[PDB]
RNA sequence: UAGUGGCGAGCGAACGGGGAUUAGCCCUUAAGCUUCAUUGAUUUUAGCGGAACGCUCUGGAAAGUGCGGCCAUAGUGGGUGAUAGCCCCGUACGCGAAAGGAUCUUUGAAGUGAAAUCAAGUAGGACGGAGCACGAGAAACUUUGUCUGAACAUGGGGGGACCAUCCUCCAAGGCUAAAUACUACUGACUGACCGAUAGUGAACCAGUACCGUGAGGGAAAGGCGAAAAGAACCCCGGAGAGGGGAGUGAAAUAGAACCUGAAACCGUAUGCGUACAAGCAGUGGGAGCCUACUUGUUAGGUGACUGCGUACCUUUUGUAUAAUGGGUCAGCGACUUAUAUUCAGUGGCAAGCUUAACCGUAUAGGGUAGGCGUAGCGAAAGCGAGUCUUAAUAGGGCGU
């Protein structure tokens, strides 16, 4: 019945309107207060502005550069090696599934749980702990 | 199970039919469908499109009247509306998994409340409205929703002029009409169609 | 996206998963005054204070 | 959906102008004066529910006092005379016996004198 | 986001992915595009036919109350004396052109594209400026105002100062549909749009009246009834204006300045109180009189007398204030929307959740590109349940 159903208690609220009456609580000012900047149309203090003291983001030094070398990096957890088909974890095989982005060339494998099955990594270079898991739990690490 | 009128059970999947009736979900699914059909065509007019009203009607001081700046202001008589609204869309995003759980929740209470009549096959022969009226007199129904696998050209030309009888498809049904009409009439071709569509 | 960050605070504040890093200050261009106990206690990379989190996380558009 | 507010404003004006009838001049017929004289006439009706209880208590006392001097006491020695014993009769139903039932009042006064207080 | 930027306010790419659309031809002379001659298709400027109902009540008048029946590829259209699938016009459907109008296409013709001939005052260079996301900056590249100047495919110029090695293209001559942007004007629809202070400035003879030397500004203005049946005739009046009858009508307190007809404002009757009494004009007690009563330990209206009592809003440490504002009434008149993001409430699936454009028999379904997660530390390379600093594997920071 469309004459019956309604939502859960608390799921909908009713958008309090400032500027109506005196019993509603928000009458005659709307929760703003009295005279000043944050009481007027467009009383927006600029984000980061302090009042005239030298702000934080103009007192501290600039401290680095950005590596364009690591715009091509990704990494795969050991637990996600069971999420591919064919048991040949190539470079394009991880792009066949949605486990990795496009335009990604160099991939590692680190230790983040149990592997799951018997695969053959090639084209990708695992860490010290991941290589001690795959070569021990029935896999093979070739190129 | 779903007792077809030719007296044979069918043993449907018990995840679609016979489920818990969450109605916070169904209320949200019928609001998003019913609001998504509204075309939004308003146009009021702000103080910048009302024709004229460029210059001050008198000086700043010395006149006695209150400080006015233009004629086409929201306080004045011929002025413009102060929060005039351009046309816009009304469309909520409902998830694909969330649209389907409202279907598996309203297709359970139609089974409990016995609004659902499953038939062997429903087929008319010539497009003529008085032939279909006599066909629905066999089942004893009135103001019914006809859900079938494919809307036949003979069946679609009938029940356009007919008053309270509507004909749909499984991929043309919606969470309003399954709640709206008095009785829902499905065929055995269509109850299998809700298996791969819902679960 | 209609939310542009500030370019200065993206160079003064790198973000890790334990807050916001920032380099210390006062260490440039007059250094023969200061004491070695004071120089090496400004060499590290600290993390931001709780009074300053909700100020910077509005300058950086994280709100 | 434009709403015009000319039919629910009128019902609230007639509800004010009904409480404010019987008043002098423009207090009973124009609205921007008759709203002040309904709020003010509601504050007075709140204060004077307390002052009602003070204007009869000051009237009961001044009738016992006149009635008990005619028999040979004061008011203040009568109340100490009744509370040597426990006659336990309040001011509302002594100032009734002072006017109407005058012979029963004299039979009370003699017992306060017999109470020697 | 990388960059850019008094490195301030800010401005902001590309590479790579996903879609819509699908043609490349010539300087040996081409597709293509024009303009006529042509043969068919497609609609377009007017139309035509177009299903099915009776009795009975109340009413001024039946579409309504009743009791039945029929039509349907036509059942929520309009309007007829009140609410009509079946009374009228229409609708679903079917057919329609002397003659023009185009749109695709027929196969011819006249052209044209078209500059002649693979590109010289051209590339590059030097000061001065612009455009590149790029405010002389290690400033590449495209442009042109002044001044100059080459190699001739064993050449050339690109790959963000510069140089060697590799890769990739042929500059100084041209032509090209489609996806695309827009609406002064048309037609068909549709509305959680307006309903005469709204909606166009304009429902009314509106860019009019009026205001200006001019450019220019710019209003107010809807409604009798189903049908004029719009008042023959009589009496007062200036032979008028206006009334009093009489007649029409369901109804003239529907009579043309006409549906309903409120508030401020002004009156006329009836009841009760006031001409020896001082003030935000009310409130608590209260005599008497009046009306209806159910005859008054009821109701209504006046209120002699008497106690307490210096309006409302806004600004302020503070207002009866000789501080602000308001002549009263009736209409309108002030926290909204869109796109991004954070926190709570309530929901879906869950180490996984979800798609944007765009397709679609179009609120379904497809589309997982992309995003946020499942692991951090470091300025970085890098290494990873650890990592950075350090001679230290010593401590310590951050993390599980
Ligand atoms: Mg408050
Ligand atoms: Mg303030
Ligand atoms: Mg104020
Ligand atoms: Mg202040
Ligand atoms: Mg992906
Ligand atoms: Mg303007
Ligand atoms: Mg101007
Ligand atoms: Mg307007
Ligand atoms: Mg979808
Ligand atoms: Mg230094
Ligand atoms: Mg006809
Ligand atoms: Mg007809
Ligand atoms: Mg109709
Ligand atoms: Mg009528
Ligand atoms: Mg009709
Ligand atoms: Mg008839
Ligand atoms: Mg060339
Ligand atoms: Mg040059
Ligand atoms: Mg060049
Ligand atoms: Mg170069
Ligand atoms: Mg290079
Ligand atoms: Mg108007
Ligand atoms: Mg009106
Ligand atoms: Mg008559
Ligand atoms: Mg009347
Ligand atoms: Mg009338
Ligand atoms: Mg009038
Ligand atoms: Mg009418
Ligand atoms: Mg009238
Ligand atoms: Mg008078
Ligand atoms: Mg006086
Ligand atoms: Mg006095
Ligand atoms: Mg204050
Ligand atoms: Mg004053
Ligand atoms: Mg004034």
β-partners of residue B8 are B4
Q: Which positions in chain A touch B25 (Cβ < 8 Å)?
A: none
Resolution for this experimental structure (Å): 3.3
CA distance B174 to A64: 57
* Minimal Cβ distance to A1: which of B24, B28, B179: B179
Sign of CA dihedral C17, A64, C53, C7: negative
Experimental technique for the deposited model: cryo-EM
CA of B163 to the centre of ligand 28 (A): 33
Do B33 and B174 form a contact (C-beta atoms < 8 A)? yes
Contact between chains at A56 and C55 (C-beta distance less than 8 A): yes
Q: Nearest chain A Cα to B178, which residue?
A: A1
Buried b / exposed e across A96-106, counting CB within 10 Å, b at 16+? eeebbeeeeee
CA of A68 to the centre of ligand 19 (A): 29
Do A119 and A139 form a contact (C-beta atoms < 8 A)? yes
Q: What share of residues in chain D are helix, strand, coil (percent, to 5)?
A: 60, 0, 40
DSSP at D13? H
Distance between the alpha carbon (CA) of A12 and the C1' atom of E139, Å = 60
Q: Which positions in chain B touch A1 (Cβ < 8 Å)?
A: 179
Q: CA angle at residue B90 from B86 to B95, to 5 degrees? A: 150
Rounded to whole angstroms, the maximal C-alpha distance in chain C is: 49
Residue A95 tokens, joined: 């792009």
- 3-state secondary structure (DSSP) of residue B185: strand
Q: Nearest chain C Cα to A60, which residue?
A: C25
Q: Which positions in chain A touch C22 (Cβ < 8 Å)?
A: 60, 63
CA of D80 to the centre of ligand 20 (A): 123
Domains held by chain B: number: 1
Sign of CA dihedral D63, D65, D69, D75: positive
Look-up of token digits 């003979």 = B154
Q: Which positions in chain B touch A11 (Cβ < 8 Å)?
A: 24
* Torsion of the alpha carbons at B126, B132, B133 and B134, rounded to the nearest 10: 80
- 3-state secondary structure (DSSP) of residue A107: strand
Distance between the alpha carbon (CA) of B31 and the C1' atom of E346, Å = 16
Nearest nt to the CA of D26 via C1' is E328
Domain edges within chain A? 1-143
CA distance D26 to D32: 9
Chains that touch D (3 or more CB pairs under 8 A): none
User: Which chain A residues touch C if contact means CB-CB below 8 Å?
Assistant: 47-48, 56-64
Residue C51 tokens, joined: 């009074």
By C-alpha to C1' distance, E307 is nearest to: D55
Beta strand ranges found along chain B (DSSP E): 116-119, 144-148, 166-169, 183-187
Which chain E nucleotides are covered by protein, judged by CB under 7 A? 1-5, 7-12, 15-17, 71-76, 190-195, 197-201, 207, 217-220, 262-265, 280-285, 301-303, 307-308, 311-312, 314-316, 326, 328-342, 345-349, 351-356, 362-371, 374-386, 397-399
Contact between chains at A5 and B176 (C-beta distance less than 8 A): no
Distance between the alpha carbon (CA) of A96 and the C1' atom of E238, Å = 112
CA of A65 to the centre of ligand 15 (A): 80
Q: Which positions in chain C touch A57 (Cβ < 8 Å)?
A: 6, 8-9, 12-13, 56, 59
Q: What is the CA radius of gyration of chain A?
A: 29
> Strands C45-47 and C19-23: what pairing?
antiparallel
CA distance B186 to B168: 10
Query: Got the DSSP string for A44-67?
Result: -PPTT--SSSPPGGGTS-------
Do D98 and D73 form a contact (C-beta atoms < 8 A)? no
Question: In 10 A of CB C19, how many CB atoms?
Answer: 14
DSSP at A74? E
Choose among B33, B20, B39, B36: nearest CA to B179: B33
Ligand number nearest CA of B64 is 35
CA distance B73 to D60: 68
Domain boundaries, position B169: 1-199
User: Which chain A residues touch B if contact means CB-CB below 8 Å?
Assistant: 1-2, 5-8, 11
Interface test with chain C among A46, A58, A63, by most C beta carbons within 10 Å: A63
Burial of A48 (0-12, 13-18, 19+ CB in 10 A): middle
Q: Nearest chain C Cα to A58, which residue?
A: C8
Distance between the alpha carbon (CA) of D54 and the C1' atom of E86, Å = 84
Domains held by chain C: number: 1
Query: Got the DSSP string for B36-93?
Result: TT---------TTTSS---S-SS-SSSSSS-----SSSTTSSS---TT----------
Rounded to whole angstroms, the maximal C-alpha distance in chain A is: 78
């Amino acid at each position: 019945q469309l004459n019956d159903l309604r939502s859960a208690p608390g799921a909908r609220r009713e958008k309090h309107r400032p500027g109506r009456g005196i019993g509603s609580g928000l009458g005659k000012t709307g929760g703003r207060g009295h005279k000043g900047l944050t009481s007027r149309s467009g009383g927006k203090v600029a984000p980061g502005f302090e009042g005239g003291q030298q702000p934080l983001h103009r007192r501290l030094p600039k401290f680095g550069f950005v590596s364009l070398k690591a715009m091509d990096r990704a990494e795969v957890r050991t637990s996600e090696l069971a999420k591919v088909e064919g048991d040949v974890v190539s470079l394009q095989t991880l792009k066949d599934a949605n486990l990795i982005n496009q335009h990604v060339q160099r991939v590692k494998v680190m230790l983040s749980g149990e592997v799951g099955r018997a695969v053959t990594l090639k084209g990708i270079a695992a860490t010290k702990g991941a290589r001690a898991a795959i070569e021990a739990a029935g896999g093979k690490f070739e190129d | 199970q779903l007792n077809v009128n030719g007296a044979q059970a069918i043993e449907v999947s018990e995840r679609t039919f016979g489920g818990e009736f969450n109605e916070t979900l169904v209320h949200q699914a019928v609001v998003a469908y019913m609001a998504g059909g509204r075309q939004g065509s308003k146009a009021q007019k702000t103080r910048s499109e009302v024709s004229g009203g460029g210059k001050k009607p008198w000086r700043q001081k010395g006149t006695g009247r209150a400080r006015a700046g233009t004629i086409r202001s929201p306080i004045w008589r011929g002025g413009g509306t102060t929060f005039a609204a351009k046309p816009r869309s009304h469309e909520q995003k409902l998830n694909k998994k969330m649209y389907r759980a409202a279907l598996r929740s309203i297709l359970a209470e139609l089974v409990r409340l016995d609004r659902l009549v499953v038939v062997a096959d429903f087929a008319v022969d010539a497009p003529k409205t008085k032939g279909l009226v006599a066909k629905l007199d066999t089942l004893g129904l009135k103001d019914v929703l006809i859900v079938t696998d494919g809307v036949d050209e003979n069946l679609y030309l009938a029940a356009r002029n007919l008053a309270h009888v509507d004909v749909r498809d499984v991929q043309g049904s919606d969470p309003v009409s399954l709640i709206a009409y008095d009785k829902v009439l499905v065929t055995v071709s269509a109850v299998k169609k809700f298996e791969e569509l819902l679960g | 996206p209609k939310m542009k960050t500030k370019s200065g605070a993206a160079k003064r504040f790198k973000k890790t998963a334990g807050g916001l890093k920032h380099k210390h200050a006062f260490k440039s261009h007059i250094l023969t005054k200061m004491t070695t106990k004071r120089k090496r206690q400004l060499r590290g990379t600290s993390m931001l204070n709780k009074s300053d989190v909700a100020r910077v996380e509005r300058s950086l558009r994280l709100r | 959906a434009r709403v015009k507010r000319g039919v629910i404003a009128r019902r609230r004006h007639k509800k004010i102008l009904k409480l404010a009838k019987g008043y002098y001049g423009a207090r009973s017929r124009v609205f921007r004066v008759a709203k002040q004289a309904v709020i003010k006439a509601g504050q007075y009706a709140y204060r004077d529910r307390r002052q009602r209880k003070r204007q009869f208590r000051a009237l009961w006392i001044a009738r016992i006092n006149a009635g008990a001097r005619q028999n040979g006491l004061s008011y203040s020695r009568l109340i100490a005379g009744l509370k040597k014993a426990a006659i336990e009769i309040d001011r509302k139903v002594l100032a009734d016996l002072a006017v109407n039932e005058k012979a029963a009042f004299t039979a009370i006064v003699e017992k306060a004198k017999a109470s020697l207080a």
